[PDB]
Amino acid sequence: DILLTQSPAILSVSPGERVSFSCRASQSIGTDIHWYQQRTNGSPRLLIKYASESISGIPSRFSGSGSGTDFTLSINSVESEDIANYYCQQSNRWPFTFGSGTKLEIKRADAAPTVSIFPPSSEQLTSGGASVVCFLNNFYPKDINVKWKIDGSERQNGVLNSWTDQDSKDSTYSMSSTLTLTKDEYERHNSYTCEATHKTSTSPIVKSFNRN
Amino acid sequence: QVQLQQPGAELVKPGASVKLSCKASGYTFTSDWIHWVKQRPGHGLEWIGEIIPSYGRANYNEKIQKKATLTADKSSSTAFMQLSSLTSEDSAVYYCARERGDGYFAVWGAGTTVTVSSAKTTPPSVYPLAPGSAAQTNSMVTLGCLVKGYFPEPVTVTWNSGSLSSGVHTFPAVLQSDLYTLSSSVTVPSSSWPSETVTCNVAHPASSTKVDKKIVPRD
Amino acid sequence: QVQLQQPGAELVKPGASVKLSCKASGYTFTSDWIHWVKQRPGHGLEWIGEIIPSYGRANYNEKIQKKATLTADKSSSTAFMQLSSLTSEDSAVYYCARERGDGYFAVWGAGTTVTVSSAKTTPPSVYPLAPGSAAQTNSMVTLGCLVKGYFPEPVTVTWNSGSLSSGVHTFPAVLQSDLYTLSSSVTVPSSSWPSETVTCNVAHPASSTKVDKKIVPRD
Amino acid sequence: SALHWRAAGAATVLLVIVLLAGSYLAVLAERGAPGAQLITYPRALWWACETATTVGYXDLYPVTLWGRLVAVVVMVAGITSFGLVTAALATWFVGREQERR
């Protein structure tokens, strides 16, 4: 069963540059290779069929070449919408098989996060419980730390973070930090702080509110 | 028109069984093969098997245990895949794709999220996220909605029925005590809110419950 | 008779376009393919594409961006290659070669130097280089001419229209402030000069300006 | 018109049919066999052509029992047909020249 190898698994390139992904077949398969694109939360999308043939509706930016056991999918001048997972697939011999996958990653200019703290909603407090959400948006690189401080004192119990893959709109990253606690726990407290430490500033960017 | 339609999600208890479907549209030829591809989270694509409707014959991946059984119904133009005796291992997104007998997968289905758990279905709780009264604003403002306490995955969050896709972020869910939770954010021109409504559409397929939630400023 | 004739040089501004030509002579068969090979300085040969005049069909290298478009003109027996939207990367020497449909390149063109710059064409300044009055001489003497301030490349320097090729050296040019400069040297029997004239022929194709320069002793 | 002339043409229409059903059936039979290469219609049609003519280059061949049986039918149909046209050309030449006497 033909083994398709894709290396490297992650490719980092500068905006506008020319990137090339490679597929290695464990035995000659002609030009019976096809390429797919899968963005985050999306389904695969045929990009190139039969190693070189272009599909209708695909930017002229995408191209493919190769024959035998070595194949290449290239992107002349990569851009944000191209951030996704690329796969190859062969139809030379049964059963059809898929490559392991290659993730395209872009290296844009450093971006500072846009912090935003949100007090628990009324309807939420009504059903019993409060959640203070904080959004760190459009920052780059993706390395970032967020500290919680309740009434001046750092908090930790009940905090659940969540990061997003590189955005296909601006090549940045974003994260959501949440601090949950029952109404009670939320009642006997006034100030809630959300701090963010990032490469862009030697000083932390913070936001906070008071359940006046 | 969406070429292949599949149920957004399916929940199955360990050892149980579920039958996924895929309804096709557009042109249909005798040379059509419907394929099923399995994708585990964070991982790649895994060909499961194929079937040729016009004839009713199916083939399966030998390199893996055969949990699937393929069948086709010519009248209703639907292909089915019977998954049996499941386990946490059989939990992932299953795609169906059509191939015109030429080797590549022209079109894919949105995919059906399958979850194998002893848990219980649970609709998500949606709440607004408007700035704080003391939060000064620039030329842009950020809002969002909090979806929590739901099961199983997934949930599809849109802003103003998709007409506001730009400036939207929907963070990955986090599992805890058998209940996922995620948040979505949006950024519209500060001056355009709340002059112009900004609602949060949340659909939870696994329970057939869609719910909106207008985002207005606090008192 | 030179089988394939190509313009010595071409200058193009970034983003612009130029159309190179190649006029053929000698026998011509229906089985003739004209190929274009691109060579960047200090590097090797890179097949760009091919065309079959008698039929007008062309094929191109897939492993590289398609800047070229091939066309042929049966009447004037000329093959053309339209290079478009150029950049510093597309700067090199382009060869055309003929293949009798048997796989090897029998004959090549002299090659057309293509330069992609925003600069401005500039003919070269030629000056003599006769020994110094106090320079004793052996059985041989050395002369030369200085070509400087020209753009773009290249320049073809010959001594006495090539009849003195032996004992000649033409150093590689050096770029500076958008103006190349090079020197050529010659060594003839000391006793044969200046009894017998020694001139320096310098041709600068990119500007269509050929100029000679007699080399006589100083005052 | 004439029997032989009709049987020939009938052999040709029948050939085209066997060629197409051959392509379909070959893929149906070969798909499911590891390593099988006769698995997409366009090339299976080209396989059928080179089999019916007997030029069998291979560049493609069946490997399953049913694929081989389908191959056997295409071979025979092609050979019978091409052989039914030779007999029609012989009947034409004989019957004709017989007048040129």
Pair (B144, B212) in one structural domain = yes
Q: Which domain holds residue C2?
A: 1-118
Task: Name chain A contacts of D62, Cβ cutoff 8 Å.
Answer: none
Second-level CATH architecture of D1-57 = Orthogonal Bundle (1.10)
Pair (B72, B147) in one structural domain = no
Size of interface A-B (CB pairs under 8 A): 125
Nearest CB to C65 within list A64, A72, A76: A76
Pair (B67, B158) in one structural domain = no
Pair (B130, B199) in one structural domain = yes
Nearest CA to A83 out of A171, A10, A175, A173 is that of A171
Nearest CA in chain A to B217: A121
Pair (B155, B174) in one structural domain = yes
Instruction: Give the count of beta carbons closer than 10 Å to the beta carbon of residue C194.
Output: 14
Domain boundary among C118, C145, C162: C118
Task: Name chain D contacts of A53, Cβ cutoff 8 Å.
Answer: none
Token pair listed for B189: 């021109």
Pair (C106, C151) in one structural domain = no
Pair (C128, C168) in one structural domain = yes
d(CA D65, CA D69): 6
Pair (C77, C139) in one structural domain = no
Pair (C164, C191) in one structural domain = yes
Pair (B127, B107) in one structural domain = no
Domain boundary among B73, B100, B118: B118
Residue A74 in contact with residue A60, Cβ under 8 Å? no
- Separation in Å, CA of A30 to nearest CA in chain B: 13
d(CA C112, CA C20): 8
Nearest CA in chain C to A73: C63
d(CA D23, CA B18): 35
Q: Which domains does chain A have, with CATH numbers?
A: 1-108 (2.60.40.10), 109-211 (2.60.40.10)
Q: Can you name the residues that pair with A86 across neighbouring β-strands?
A: A37, A102
Domain boundary among B95, B118, B141: B118
Where are any strands of DSSP class E within A140-200?
Answer: 144-150, 153-155, 159-163, 173-181, 191-198
Q: Is C65 on the interface with A (CB under 8 A)?
A: yes
d(CA C154, CA C204): 7
For chain C, what is the domain count?
Answer: 2
Q: Is A99 on the interface with B (CB under 8 A)?
A: yes
Instruction: Give the count of beta carbons closer than 10 Å to the beta carbon of residue C36.
Output: 26
Residue B33 in contact with residue B51, Cβ under 8 Å? yes
Pair (B15, B99) in one structural domain = yes
Optimal mutation site among D24, D43, D45, interface B, most CBs of chain B within 10 A: D24
Long-range contacts of B71-77, Cβ-Cβ distance < 8 Å, separation of 24 or more: B72/B34, B76/B23, B77/B23, B77/B24, B77/B25, B77/B28, B77/B53
Q: How determined?
A: X-ray
Whether the link from the prior residue into A8 is cis, omega within 30° of 0, is yes
Query: What is the length of chain D?
Result: 101
Token pair listed for A34: 């096809």
Query: Resolution reached, in Å?
Result: 2.8
Nearest CA to B156 out of B115, B203, B200, B124 is that of B203
Q: What DSSP state is assigned to residue B132?
A: P
List gaps in chain A by the residue before each (C–N > 2.5 Å): none
**Are the Cβ atoms of A36 and B97 closer than 8 angstroms?**
no
Task: Name chain C contacts of A18, Cβ cutoff 8 Å.
Answer: 65
Task: Name chain A contacts of D32, Cβ cutoff 8 Å.
Answer: 94
Instruction: Give the count of beta carbons closer than 10 Å to the beta carbon of residue C45.
Output: 13
Pair (C160, C86) in one structural domain = no
Nearest CA to A18 out of A75, A103, A66 is that of A75
Q: Which CATH number fits the domain that encloses residue B74? A: 2.60.40.10
